[PDB]
Every structure is written in structure tokens, then in C-alpha cells.
Design an enzyme around this catalytic site. Structure first.
Site, mmCIF file in Angstrom:
data_model
loop_
_atom_site.group_PDB
_atom_site.id
_atom_site.type_symbol
_atom_site.label_atom_id
_atom_site.label_comp_id
_atom_site.label_asym_id
_atom_site.label_seq_id
_atom_site.Cartn_x
_atom_site.Cartn_y
_atom_site.Cartn_z
ATOM 1 N N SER A 42 4.948 -3.014 11.899
ATOM 2 C CA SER A 42 3.862 -2.834 10.950
ATOM 3 C C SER A 42 2.769 -2.095 11.674
ATOM 4 O O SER A 42 2.355 -2.416 12.725
ATOM 5 N N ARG A 43 2.404 -0.990 11.025
ATOM 6 C CA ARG A 43 1.684 0.105 11.674
ATOM 7 C C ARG A 43 0.249 -0.080 11.439
ATOM 8 O O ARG A 43 -0.387 -0.816 12.188
ATOM 9 N N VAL A 44 -0.227 0.514 10.349
ATOM 10 C CA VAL A 44 -1.584 0.478 9.901
ATOM 11 C C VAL A 44 -1.620 -0.379 8.686
ATOM 12 O O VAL A 44 -2.678 -0.479 8.073
ATOM 13 N N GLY A 45 -0.551 -1.117 8.475
ATOM 14 C CA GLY A 45 -0.489 -2.127 7.501
ATOM 15 C C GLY A 45 -0.705 -3.438 8.075
ATOM 16 O O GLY A 45 -0.783 -4.456 7.381
ATOM 17 N N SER A 46 -0.829 -3.541 9.431
ATOM 18 C CA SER A 46 -0.890 -4.808 10.178
ATOM 19 C C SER A 46 -2.311 -5.208 10.161
ATOM 20 O O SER A 46 -3.191 -4.606 10.808
#
Lengths: 71, 468, 53, 146, 470, 73, 120
Positions: free
Chosen positions: A9-13
Site C-alpha cells: 500500500s503506497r499512497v493509500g497507506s
């Protein structure tokens, strides 16, 4: 039944507040420490790997849940 | 109705041009008068200008552009009722078996719309049989799709026959065995065999009605036979409130034939060399199969793999629709166990805690677990030797072997061969047996003395008879 | 004593190898299948673009 | 700039068709390069002509053919690509001793993306040529650079 | 009335369309000629598209075809020359001399097409070719009537194989031959032309023992296709009317398959078998039936064949395998190993091999060889992992004879004096049968592996035992 | 039903585009559902949408795309 | 980029995430356009179009535009035409596969699939 070894989870984390910051600052990285120890176990015969192994095994057992009954 | 002259005959794709007012609606059935019987053509496009594009159901030979055509007013109408059973019918609903015109009080169209949302299987249901293995480890359900696996002539025929037999006792019901890709040599043998084992009677009514779709009839007659049997089943369900079991043969040869129907109409056959309208056609087929308030059609379908692949588009589309898989194999048959069922490969998505109650699920898990643990142990138990067995380990061996033998039904369909009176073991009574074996209350009863018996009652007898 | 251990050891090693090669046969079988399926679709499409033009 | 440093420009000719520049000019560059080579050959002098890479000429000719409506062959390349490669490569001839024994030498080159030898174009070139000087990716790693 | 005027309508590469006038009534397989600066461009009509308009294939250049330029109608297929005075001259695909010694002499002419001889005409083989190459001679010999095929990849010495057979077999037999070159390089033609002029198979006076027909690949795809039909016609003339055996040779016959594939898409015939002409079976079929033994002559072809990507389970070679009687398989590996030729021992197979036709002893010996090598190849796996000393004593000895046999396939050639530099050998059929047998019987396992390396006949094998010892 | 036993159906929307249903209905199925979801979103309210399964939508659209002679992948 | 390169006399730098998108959208418009789709499905006008964009950010004598170009590998196939014609306009690569990214290795550069002509 989710592998955190294959999940990311990238910039959703974000969803980790203080409660979920203290207790472990992401249990997923540690369970990608388990993956290593159990990679080469089946790693070390040293107490360090065996402590993680022993934690990782207990933790995997603890996840097990019943379908359509959430917590 | 309106009349028109054939204006093409390319392949088995015949276009008919009608006197100007309107054309047939789509899916309608057209009848061609010729000295080749009749040819029933089904409309699968409107080209416009009062012309059609059709697929054939009967070989395309002895046609001439200029033959007069007639529009029925809708789909091909197949007979239905209880005067059609035990008699083989081709795609137009008329005899191949030559026992005299297959007619009944009512006819119904092969294409129908699926029931409402409200009238679908909305809550769980259980369809009780006589077999212990199916009823424990993979419970057949009403409106359930169970995809049969394995080859023909090792037990397959015995398995089909059995379930047809169980249904009459259970409800009073009927079945229709539909054969797609059917070979005509084999078809005579199945009808003669079906007579012998008591499920088709030469005098009046029977149980199963047979629908055969020969390969010497065009791809459409292979495709629409599945629809032809469905209409029969539904008549019992809707207007006589009886439960039915509808077999399909190989689902490879439903797929094989549909590709040709696609490619021919104008469409592209792309879907790894098969039709792109495959999913949507299975969707129409397997959503009219369901539990209505008056009755229910349940379907057993047969999976044939293309080259031993479960990763292909046709196996894949089938596996989504299917709720259980029953897996016959030969290994089982050679150990003298008839049904041929594999309890390791017997699984359902209707095997749960809340679908068959808690007790049923929890006994099934143990019964599965014993056999799984016995297998793991057995790997090194054979190699090490049968005396390097633990006290603990031999407790798992013993329980499993009791269960393995106990499953067998000396059932009525395979009665002649072993010589042993038939058995139907109901679902509640299967669960109950398994409870006493789990607590080891029959560890005084020898392992081999569970041979060829059914329920709890049955093995009381065999125990005495072995000692005697 | 050494020779007995050796002949025992080779049995053990070679057993674990039968299983190791097996795990790999199954993995290359999954690739084999996927690979054949893509070739069939790519063959098909070439005909379609041609017919069409 | 490497050639001018090593003093290899006073006999060298460079023929070019860069990627930005059109598909016609891209097709036409090997065939116009052939002629400059042939002049040396004819006069009884020698030359050697590198045609790098012809696989991208086939793509140039593919673009060309499909927007003049010539049906796609095996892998979209037109059904006459081989005819292009054949007619070009054979102008690397030697002549009789009346003409002075001049010979154009050719080195074609096929830069392959996956390394598949069951593709249409790599096959097509192999037949035409009298020898093969296979270079492999693996052997680069192993420490033979180039 | 037949117009003698057509005007060209569309030049789209090799495809040339003509607009003939009123009453023409076009017919397929005709020849249209257009006057051009590069001579007379021949067009073989391969469609009529209707209303007096043909769509044709070119046999000459269309980089100077002018539109609006008058197109005569000649009719039928073109007519080449045949005879016995047509030997040892180089004949073009359109029938014209590129060897530049006035016209190619005639008596009679026939066209490049011929109908294939009927069942009643066909007759069996009864003569046995002997090539003088020990591997071919023991494990798959050819017989006159046959449609031999030299399957291999690239780099396995395809031209050299074809060269060897002319060096031996061609001189030997009493008949004349035809050498046909389909779509090949300007180096290879010249190599064949010099080497055999010197060897006297090509002579400036007629009545030779070969013919030359060079069609080349820098000529349009249609020409490459009909260079073969042209040479073949010379051989039919031999066979029937002038009653002489031919030991025909064609090279490379993949250029014939590949050529049909190019003009196939453009004529509208969408590819089939993936990238190949849909008319693959019938074009082959027609070609192969002409080459046969009948009531007179026996025309036994040796055809080179190119397997693409070194893989012979691909549809273009596999279709062909059926069409040819006496296959051989060659490969890169064997050639590089020092074993000349690269023919494989178990993969060389004939449908003309019978146990009686080649005699019982021969058959039994070649079977033993096939077994011993096959045990060797099964054992390769065991030897890789297990080791060579965990083999039984029967097994160990089979390994050893199989190694001797494996190096007993190696014979140098004169035309492979560009590899070893040691001239060729001639090995008689009986001598192969007897020397292989001796190895297998265990009486001739006193001889080492390297003394079967680089040998002829039997006499040679004995001579090499002495040389290495000193 | 499952939702209505557990007391939760009334705060959820269900959209259906079955497999017996025509190829445009399946195609348009996700785009429409998301329109209802956006109306909840743009009232500053929080929402959720599960598109189960978009791969079968890809199939439903494929038949349409293939007849529209748009490239295959 | 051109404005900074020429007019303002500057050496520039450049980042792109992803130039696969350029290639893929152009493949969608090509059928409609009047063009026959080539092998795999990609457009036939592909080479010419891609060249022009990467020569519009070239090494000029007024400014040197160092580019980092990311092409997202289509369907785990890097031999396909969209990532392949990219190599033509390149001197260095750092090829990244997903497998090496997941195991806990950031940056995900394959060490056995990298080559450079900026290494000597």
C-alpha cells in the site's frame, strides 16, 4: 487469507492512529520477517530466528476466524 | 402466417426473404416443407428488409432458393408431461427410437425467460439422496449445480442411475437425461441398460426421459437439446410442484458446438478459439435452474477438460457456476467400493455451519481430517514399515479404515454384481452414524465388518455375520 | 560405520530431492499451460485482421 | 565522434534514417546505402556495408504497406518482406578479373527483442546469409563485453 | 476476337493487373508479355477478377513497369527447351541463357507445367542407390523412384551434403541428371558451376551429365516458384520420350514453399497453418508425383529442405516429411563435433527400407546399431547423475561399442576440404555392412574409437589401427 | 437475505446485472452504481462501493468490442 | 521542456510517469483513424510517433535534457512493442520486475537485466 508479502500500500497507506501506532508500527513488516525465518527453516538455530518463528507461528494461528463473524 | 421464399443457402446458414410487412421475431421457429422431412430453422439476427439469418437444427441438403417458408409464431415447441418419459427425443421433440409419435396434452417453447428475483433460491435448501458420501461431505442442494468428473463406463452410468432411483422414493419425481455430443451406438446401449436397471419401463410411465443430440445433426441441435430437456423438468416444477434432476453430458461438447454457432452467424469466435457469448449463454441456462415455490429443478452437469487444464476459459466459466464437485475415480472401484466417490475430492460451497446446521459441518470436518491425517502418516508408515507405527499414529489408521469401508452402499443399481440388497441412506441418518464412530463406541466392531453396508442400523448385522 | 551412514544418507537426500523436483514440475506445468493458451489467441487474431481487411 | 577520435573517418560513409524521421525515408535508407557501396565494387575497389538493423526496416515497410492496404501476413509483416532482404544482400558480390575483382561485403544485423528465432523476420535473413555470428545475452554477463 | 492489347491497371509489387479489351474471354495459366527495357516481363495468369481483367504474378521486374503500356496475350504456360542438347547449359526461369553461348538448343519444347502421371503409369522401385557414405548406406538407403529429403537446420552443411552426392553418384550412373537451383545466393551458384566444370559434369558441348537451371532470389517471388517447374520439365522428357534415368537434384525446396506463401496473402488466399499457403498440400503433391518411376525412366530426386528455427515439429516441415520417401535429419551439434556428415543415426529413416530389399544381414546389423545407440542415449541420463561406474558390465560394454560406432559415422569429403582438407572416400555397400557387424560381434572392440574416426571402407579401418599405435 | 438476517440491508444498495442479462446491461453496470455513490460523496458524506467482479464486465464489454472491430489484447 | 531548452538557454531535466500511456491511447485511436493494427494489437505508425516525442527533448547545444522515462510493462511482457521501441532511444536501463519489489527489495532494479553504454 491475505498474504502481506504480496499486498502493498503506497499512497493509500493511512488508517493507523495512535493506538495502532504504539502496539506495533505495522505488523506487516514483522510478518515479512517471519517469511524469511520460515523460508530457510524449511532459518538460524540461534534463539533470535526461533523467537520470531515462535511468534510468527502463534500469530498465524491467532488470525483464524469464522466466516461472516467479524470482531 | 406470413410466407416467403428462401433466398440463400450458404453453409447451414439459410436466409429467408418474406413478403413485405414484417419479419419473424428473434428466436422464432420456422418450418420448411421439403422431401427431407421438415427443417426447423431458428432466427438469430434480422438483416433488415424482411430477411433473416438462421441456424439449422437438421442437415442442410435438399434445399432450393424459392421453397416456401412458414413462421410458427415462436420458439420450437417440445412436448411435456408424463407421457414423454422413457422415450428418446431429438432437438425438435420427435422420436428417434421409432415407438410412435411423441405427443402429449401440452407443448412448451425451448426458450423461456428465467424466474423473478423473488422466486429464485433465496434461502438454503437440502436435497436428500441415499448415498452417504454425497450427503455428508458435499450435500446436494435444491437448484444446486454439481459438476461430475471422471470417465464413462467405470461407474459413471451406475452413479446416474442411482440418483434417478433415489428421487422417486424421496419425492415422486422425475429426471431427464440430456446427452449432448451423443454417439448413436452408445445411445442404444444407455436406453437398453436403463431399461434393465429399472428406471425405464416398457409398459406406460417411467422415471427418466431421454434427450439425445447426435453429431450427425448440425451444431444447433447439439446446443438446443440442453434447453429441450429443461422445459420438461420445469413443467413438473411449475404445474405439478415436483423436484427434478437434470443431467448434462460433457460440457466441452456444449462449448464445441456453440463456437460453430457463433462463428457462422457473422460473429467472431474469439475466446481462445471459442465463442465470446459463452458466459452469457451459461447464464441463461443455469439461471432458469433454481428453486421456485412450487418445486425445484437441480442440475448435475459433466466437466470434460480440454487437455487436462483447469486454467482454460471453458473450465473456468463452468467452475464459477458450480456449487459442488463430486469426483468419481477408478482407484476406489478397484478396492470394491461402489459409489466411486472420492471423499477427499468431495466438496461443496454449501457444506457450512449455517447451511446444514452446525453438527453436520463439524462431523464432516472430522471425517475429512481423519482420512487426511491417515494419508500423511501412510507415506512414511509404508516406507519405514508397518511396525514403526506409533500408538498415537495407529489410532488414526484404525479410525480411517473403519470410515473407508463404512461409506459403501450395496445400492440397487449395482445390486446384480455384488449380489447384495439395495440401500437408501437419508442425510439425517448419515450424520448420526458418524457421531458414534467419532467417540469410538464401535471400536469393538472389526474394521472389515463395516464392509458393504449403509447407515448405523445396517452395520449391526454385518458384525454378527462376520463372527458367524 | 561410515559406509552404513553414507548409504542411509543418500536415501534420505534423494527422497527429499524427489519431492523438490516434484514441487518444481508442478510449477513449470502451470507456466506450460498458460503459455500454450496465449499462443492460440495470438495465432487467431492474425487471421481475423487479415479477413477483415 | 568516436570514429573521428580514432581517425577512421577518411574512408567511411555514414548513411542515416533516425527514428523521428519518416517511415518512407526509413525504408529507403538501406537501399540508398547499397548504391554508395556498389560504386566501389564496380570500380574494382572494396567496401563493407553494415546494414544495422534490418528488423526495423521491416517495421518501416509494414507501416508503409498497411496504410496502402496490403494484407497482413505472419505477425503483421507483409508477404514480400523476404523479397526486400534478398534483393539488397546479394549486391555483395565479387566480380570477374576483367572488372578488377571488386567485392562489396555485407554485414546485416537483426536486433531481436525477445530473442525468438521462430519469428518470421529472423528466419528470413538466416536463409539469405552464408554464415551466422550469433551473439548472446547471457555471455555478456559472464564477462565477454562486447 | 482476342485482343492483343491490354493496358496495365495496378502495380502493387509483384501483382500486375491488366485491362484487356472486348471479347477477350481470359483463361487462367496463360502468359502475358509486356515489352520493357529489361526484356520481356512474363506474367502467369493466376486469377481473372472479371470483365476481361486478370490479376497476375510477375516473373521479372516491375520497377520499370509503365502503366498504359501494351500487354500482348501469348497463351498457356511458357515453353522452355528440353532435349539432350539442353545439358550443361545454365537456363533462366523464363527459359533464356545466362551462360551466353547463343540460344539453348532445341528439338522439341514442352511447357513448365505437366499433368501428373496416372496410377496405371506408376511402377515400383527395384534398384538400390549407394551413396558411399557409411551412415546413409547402413541406416537408411535410398532406391530409384524415391523422393529423398535432406531435412536440417542451417549450419549443418546443406550445400556440402548436396555436393558430395554429385561428386560420387553422378559420374557413376549411366543416366544424365538435372541440377535445379531455387532461390539461392550468387555465391552458391558460382561455387557449383566452377567445381563441376572442372569435374567435367558441366561441359560446353551438350549431352552432359547434368543440366543447370539457376533461378535466384533477387528475382520476384513468382520466378522463384516457377524455376522449379522449369527444371522438372527437362527430367520428364528424359523419362518418357528419351527413356533415360535421371538423378535429379533440386536445392533449396523451402524457397519453393516460402515463395508460394508470399504471393498467397496478396492474391487474397488468407494464410493457413500459421503464415503459410493454404495450398501447401496440393502444390507439394503435384510436384512430387511428377518425380517417380513409371514404365520407362526412373526420376529420383534429391531435395534439400530447410527446417526453420531448428525445430522439426513445426507444420511446414511436418507436412513435407509425409511427401518424402527417405528422410534424413541433420543438426548443428553433430557437424561441430567433428562427425561428418551431421546426419543423425536413428533419425535417418526410409519407407524403402525393408529386410529383404536391402537383404537380411544388412537389416539385422543396422537394427543392432539402432539398439546400441538407443541404450547409449538412455544411459546418458544415468551417467550424468549416478556416474559411469554404477552401470552393469553389459551396459558398460554397450557404452563402449556405441562410442566406437558414433565415431564410425565420421568420413571426410572432398567438398568438405573447406573443413578437414582430406579428400573424399568411396565406401561400397557390403563393406559398411561387414565392418559395423564386426564391432557389434565383440571381435573388433580391439580397435579404438579414433581409428574409426576419419576412415573410409574396411581396408581403411585396419590401416588406422597401426598408425595410432606408432 | 444474508444482509436482512443480520440487520444491515437498509444501509446498503445492491445493483444486479446477472449473467443471463444482455451484454450492454453488464457493461453499464458499474458506471451507473457509482453515479448513486457520487451523490452520497458530493453531499460531503462518506461512502463505499465494491465492484464485484470487473473482470466479468470486461467479458461483457468484449463481445461488444469484438463486434465493433476494436483491437484485441 | 523546449521553452526551457532553447529560449531560456537552460540545461533541463525530465521525468515522465508513464510514457506507456502515450503509446496505448494512440493504439486505441488507430482503428478509428483508418489504420490496420499490427502484431500484439499495437498501431503500425508506432515507431515514427514515439521517435518524434523523444527527439523533442533532445541533447541540443543550448540545453541538455536528461530524461528518465518509465514505461509500465504490459501484462508482464517486456518484449512487446511499446517497451521494446523505447530501448532504441536509450543508452542506459535499470529494468524493474515486480517479483524483486515484493520480496522486500527497494529499488526493484534487476541486477542481471541492466546494461549501459555510460559504463566504461
Amino acid at each position: 487469507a491475505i498474504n502481506v508479502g504480496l499486498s502493498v500500500s503506497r499512497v493509500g497507506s493511512a488508517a493507523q492512529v495512535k493506538a495502532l501506532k504504539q502496539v506495533a508500527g505495522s505488523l506487516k513488516l514483522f510478518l515479512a520477517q517471519y517469511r524469511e525465518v520460515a523460508a530457510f527453516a524449511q532459518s538460524d538455530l540461534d534463539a533470535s530466528t526461533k523467537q520470531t518463528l515462535v511468534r510468527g507461528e502463534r500469530l498465524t494461528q491467532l488470525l483464524k476466524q469464522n466466516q461472516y463473524s467479524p470482531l | 402466417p406470413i410466407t416467403g421464399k428462401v433466398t440463400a443457402v450458404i453453409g447451414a446458414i439459410v436466409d429467408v426473404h418474406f413478403e413485405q410487412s414484417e419479419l419473424p421475431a428473434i428466436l422464432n421457429a420456422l418450418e420448411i416443407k421439403t422431401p427431407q422431412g421438415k427443417l426447423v430453422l431458428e432466427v438469430a439476427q434480422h438483416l433488415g428488409e424482411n430477411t433473416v439469418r438462421t441456424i439449422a437444427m437438421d442437415g442442410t441438403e435438399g434445399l432450393v432458393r424459392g421453397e416456401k417458408v412458414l413462421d410458427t409464431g415462436g420458439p420450437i415447441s417440445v412436448p411435456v408431461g408424463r407421457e414423454t418419459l422413457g422415450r428418446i427425443i431429438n432437438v425438435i421433440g420427435e422420436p428417434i427410437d421409432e415407438r410412435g409419435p411423441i405427443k402429449s396434452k401440452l407443448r412448451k417453447p425451448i426458450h423461456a425467460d428465467p424466474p423473478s428475483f423473488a422466486e429464485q433460491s433465496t434461502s438454503a435448501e437440502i436435497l436428500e439422496t441415499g448415498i452417504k458420501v454425497v450427503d455428508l461431505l458435499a450435500p446436494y442442494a435444491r437448484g444446486g449445480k454439481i459438476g461430475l468428473f471422471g470417465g464413462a463406463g467405470v461407474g459413471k452410468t451406475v452413479f446416474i442411475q442411482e440418483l434417478i432411483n433415489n428421487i422417486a422414493k424421496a419425492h415422486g419425481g422425475f429426471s431427464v437425461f440430456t446427452g449432448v455430443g451423443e454417439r448413436t451406438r452408445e445411445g442404444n446401449d444407455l436406453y437398453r441398460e436403463m431399461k434393465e436397471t429399472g428406471v425405464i419401463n416398457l409398459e406406460g410411465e417411467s422415471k427418466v426421459a431421454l434427450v439425445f443430440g447426435q453429431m450427425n445433426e448440425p451444431p444447433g441441435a447439439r446446443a438446443r437439446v440442453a434447453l429441450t430437456g429443461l422445459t420438461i423438468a420445469e413443467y413438473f416444477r411449475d404445474e405439478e410442484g415436483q423436484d427434478v434432476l437434470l443431467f448434462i453430458d460433457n460440457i466441452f461438447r456444449f462449448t464445441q458446438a456453440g463456437s460453430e454457432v457463433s462463428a457462422l452467424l457473422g460473429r467472431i469466435p474469439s475466446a481462445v478459439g471459442y465463442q465470446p457469448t459463452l458466459a452469457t449463454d451459461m447464464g441463461l441456462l443455469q439461471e432458469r435452474i433454481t428453486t421456485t415455490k412450487k418445486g425445484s429443478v437441480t442440475s448435475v452437469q459433466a466437466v470434460y477438460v480440454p487437455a487436462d487444464d483447469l486454467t482454460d476459459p471453458a473450465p473456468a466459466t463452468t467452475f464459477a457456476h458450480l456449487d459442488a464437485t463430486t469426483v468419481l475415480s477408478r482407484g476406489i472401484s478397484e478396492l470394491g467400493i461402489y459409489p466411486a466417490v472420492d471423499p477427499l475430492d468431495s466438496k461443496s460451497r454449501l457444506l457450512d455451519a449455517a447451511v446444514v446446521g452446525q453438527e453436520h459441518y463439524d462431523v464432516a470436518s472430522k471425517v475429512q481430517e481423519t482420512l487426511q491425517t491417515y494419508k500423511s502418516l501412510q507415506d512414511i508408515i509404508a516406507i519405514l514399515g508397518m511396525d514403526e507405527l506409533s500408538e498415537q499414529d495407529k489410532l488414526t489408521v484404525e479410525r480411517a479404515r473403519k470410515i473407508q469401508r463404512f461409506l459403501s452402499q450395496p445400492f440397487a443399481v449395482a445390486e446384480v454384481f455384488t449380489g447384495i440388497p439395495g440401500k437408501l441412506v437419508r442425510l439425517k441418518d448419515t450424520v448420526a452414524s458418524f457421531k458414534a464412530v467419532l467417540e469410538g463406541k464401535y471400536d469393538n466392531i472389526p474394521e472389515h465388518a463395516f464392509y458393504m453396508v449403509g447407515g448405523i442400523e445396517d452395520v449391526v448385522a454385518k458384525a454378527e455375520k462376520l463372527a458367524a | 560405520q561410515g559406509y552404513a551412514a553414507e548409504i542411509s544418507a543418500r536415501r534420505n537426500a534423494m527422497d527429499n530431492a524427489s519431492k523438490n523436483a516434484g514441487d518444481m514440475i508442478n510449477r513449470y506445468s502451470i507456466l506450460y499451460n498458460r503459455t500454450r493458451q496465449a499462443v492460440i489467441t495470438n495465432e487467431l487474431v492474425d487471421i481475423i485482421t487479415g479477413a477483415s481487411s | 565522434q568516436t570514429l573521428e577520435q580514432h581517425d577512421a573517418m577518411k574512408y567511411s560513409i555514414i548513411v542515416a534514417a533516425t527514428a523521428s524521421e519518416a517511415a518512407p525515408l526509413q525504408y529507403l535508407a538501406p537501399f540508398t546505402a547499397a548504391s554508395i557501396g556498389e560504386w566501389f565494387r564496380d570500380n574494382g575497389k572494396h567496401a563493407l556495408i553494415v546494414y544495422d538493423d534490418l528488423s526495423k526496416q521491416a517495421v518501416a515497410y509494414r507501416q508503409l504497406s498497411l496504410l496502402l492496404r496490403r494484407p497482413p501476413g505472419r505477425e503483421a509483416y507483409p508477404g514480400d518482406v523476404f523479397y526486400l532482404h534478398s534483393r539488397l544482400l546479394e549486391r555483395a558480390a565479387k566480380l570477374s578479373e576483367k572488372e578488377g575483382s571488386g567485392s562489396l561485403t555485407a554485414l546485416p544485423v537483426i536486433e531481436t527483442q525477445g530473442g525468438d528465432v521462430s519469428a518470421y523476420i529472423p528466419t528470413n535473413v538466416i536463409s539469405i546469409t552464408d554464415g551466422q555470428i550469433f551473439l548472446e545475452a547471457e555471455l555478456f554477463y559472464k564477462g565477454i563485453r562486447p
